[PDB]
């Protein structure tokens, strides 16, 4: 039920007809053999890179959400003067430098607990114990937990665990690329992402990157 079964060797690859490398057997989610350079050779380092991909993708997903959804609300008439690449320069309280150090303190606690999970899995355990009940030992990056799996979707309730982790990773790789598009086309157009979408959808031919 909850085993994290891998993908088969005859799985879809990033490049059909190509040989997948031997260090991408399929144990990780979203394994399509993408390794033209082979940065995940050492498996002790490929674990760290899988955790890197997972956290990078989760942050990129929350970020693309926090960029496009609030812009949809601005178009609906909820938020004023919204522009994500100028939303750090605009005014708040706490000067944006007290906010930074408070952020570093709180995220240092959080990401330090996550780091202690990465170095040694059982150190910072949560989901407190109960009498005559066994909380299952989780994996790194997928802690389960009362705080991060309160709907119990991680152990494989609606779908298997491998396909759900692959959903996370694929949706999140797409979000990572979406945020790269945000960081690039908000500086080479000096405009809004949703505005750029509607502008390309107006005339897809001539409203492309080559106009600028």
């Amino acid at each position: 039920s909850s085993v994290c079964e891998p993908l088969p060797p005859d799985r879809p690859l990033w490049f059909p007809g190509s040989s997948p490398p031997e260090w991408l057997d399929g144990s990780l989610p979203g394994d399509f053999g993408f390794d033209p350079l082979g940065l995940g050779s050492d498996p002790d380092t490929l674990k760290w890179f899988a955790q890197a991909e997972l956290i990078h993708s989760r942050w990129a997903m929350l970020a693309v959400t926090g960029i496009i959804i609030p812009e949809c609300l601005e178009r609906l008439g909820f938020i004023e003067n919204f522009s994500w690449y100028d939303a750090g320069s605009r005014e708040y309280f706490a000067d944006s430098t007290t906010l930074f150090v408070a952020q570093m303190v709180l995220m240092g606690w959080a990401e330090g607990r996550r780091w202690a999970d990465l170095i040694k899995p059982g150190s910072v355990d949560i989901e407190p114990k109960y009498p005559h009940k066994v909380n299952p030992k989780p994996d790194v990056g997928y802690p389960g937990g009362l705080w991060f799996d309160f709907m119990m979707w991680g152990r494989g309730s609606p779908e298997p665990v491998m396909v759900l982790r692959t959903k996370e990773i694929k949706n999140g790789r797409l979000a990572m690329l979406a945020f790269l598009g945000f960081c690039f086309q908000a500086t080479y157009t000096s405009q809004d992402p949703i505005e750029n979408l509607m502008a390309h959808l107006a005339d897809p031919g001539h409203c492309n990157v080559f106009s600028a």
């Binding site: 350079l37 082979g38 940065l39 995940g40 050779s41 050492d42 380092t45």
Partner: protein, 42 residues
């Protein structure tokens, strides 16, 4: 990447990385605090 971290661990690659970082540090300090001849901060 296996055996690239061993190459980057080698004495000249590691020395150029350390001294590039260190030289950039000194360079940016001298941009921030140029023309220094005393330590007045106590």
């Amino acid at each position: 990447m296996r055996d690239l971290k061993t190459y980057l661990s080698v004495a000249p690659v590691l020395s150029t990385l350390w001294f590039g970082s260190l030289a950039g540090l000194l360079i940016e300090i001298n941009r921030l605090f140029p023309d220094a001849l005393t330590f007045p901060f106590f």
